[PDB]
Every structure is written in structure tokens, then in C-alpha cells.
Design a protein around this ligand. Sequence first.
Ligand SMILES: *[C@H]1O[C@H](CO)[C@@H](O[C@@H]2O[C@H](CO)[C@@H](O)[C@H](O)[C@H]2NC(C)=O)[C@H](O)[C@H]1NC(C)=O
Ligand code: NAG
Length: 193
Amino acid sequence: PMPFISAKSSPVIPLDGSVKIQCQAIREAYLTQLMIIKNSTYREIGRRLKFWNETDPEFVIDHMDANKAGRYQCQYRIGHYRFRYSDTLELVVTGLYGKPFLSADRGLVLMPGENISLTCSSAHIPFDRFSLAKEGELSLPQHQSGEHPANFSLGPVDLNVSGIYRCYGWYNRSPYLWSFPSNALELVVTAID
Ligand SMILES: *[C@H]1O[C@H](CO)[C@@H](O[C@@H]2O[C@H](CO)[C@@H](O)[C@H](O)[C@H]2NC(C)=O)[C@H](O)[C@H]1NC(C)=O
Ligand SMILES: *[C@@H]1O[C@H](CO)[C@@H](O)[C@H](O)[C@H]1NC(C)=O
């Protein structure tokens, strides 16, 4: 098990936003610094916070841009020149490409168990892949699709599927750089009808 590396704010940060990262404390570390990976090379980044309301080291990265998007790890210097790292965290920056369009082939309100797929298009920008995000959620959108027609299925829906959804740009060359959110699309599952 590797030291955890959570993100207090969403891992999805708008163009010039700012995010707060937290690493797992390691009693034997003389120094702990947030590192960002770039071409198999660890680079110092972000800023350390002060001791209060929490123990595990917290950092903060502001003025988000392409350069700050990507994989992150925590570097624990457990000696003059001996280190160990936390698990990996990914941060994506949004607002680098025009917004795509999200829609559905059904009715936005539906009985549980029903099936529905959301489609995310882009009649201009040849996005390599697409990612669907559920607004409320505190994390990183993992539900993606490479299909050009862009199909996001949700199999048998349950009351938990309800909520507002948005879709993003996304390019293979530059994976951690997404477009501006697409139009939002609300769904509501209810067994009452
Ligand atoms: C994307 O989702 C699945 C493919 O993974 C397709 O599902 C079929 O959808 C048609 C009409 O929408 C239904 O008649 C079939 O019963 C579905 N079968 C499956 C695979 O579950 C879906 O069509 C695709 N998106 C669309 C509508 O183009
Ligand atoms: C939803 O679609 C699946 C195919 O992926 C089908 O097997 C299922 O029966 C449909 N809804 C239900 C649970 O009846």
C-alpha cells in the first residue's frame, strides 16, 4: 500500500482555477513535497500549508494551466537522498477546447431499470475521446468513450443515476486537457408514475 494522495477540491479544474491536494503523512519523512510527472521526470510544484484542523500535509496549486495538468505524486525524502512516493493523482484542466453537445435518445425522466444512453457530439472539433461527468460528484470523471458518435450508456438505471451531467473535449495527444463543459443534461429516475 502506497501513501494516499486525495484531492480536497475537484480534480477537474477550469482554465485558471486552483486545487488543494493532500498527501498521506509519513512519520519518517524529513521533507514532503508535491511532485508532478512530466516525461518520466518528477518536478516540484504547488505550495505547502500550515498545521491546523488536519495532520497529513496539504498543498495548493493555483493559476491552473496546461503545464499543471497531468499526474501527481508525493515525494517523501526519508534521508539526505532517499525517497518514496505516494499513490498517483491525476488533474485535468478544462477550457482548452470549445464545448461539445450532450443529448439523449429518450426522455430525461425515467423508471428504474430503464436503459438510456447519452451522446456527446462536436460538429467541428475532432476530439479523440470524450468524458461524461456528473456534476454533484467530488472526483474525477472516469466514464469515458472513444466512439466518435460518443455513446455513454448507463445500463439499468437506479435512483442514483438522477442528477445533472456534462460532457468534455479530450485529446489523446493531450489527455489532461479538456474542453469547456458541454451543455448540462438533467436526468431524474423515479419509480413513481
Ligand atoms: C450505444 O449504446 C448501445 C451500444 O453499446 C446501443 O444500445 C442499443 O440501442 C438500441 C437503440 O438505441 C436498442 O434498440 C438496443 O436494444 C440496444 N442494445 C444494446 C447494445 O444494449 C445504443 O444504440 C448506442 N447508442 C445509440 C442509441 O446509437
Ligand atoms: C437494458 O438493456 C439490456 C442490454 O444491455 C437488456 O439486457 C436489459 O433487459 C434492458 N433492461 C432490462 C433490465 O430489462
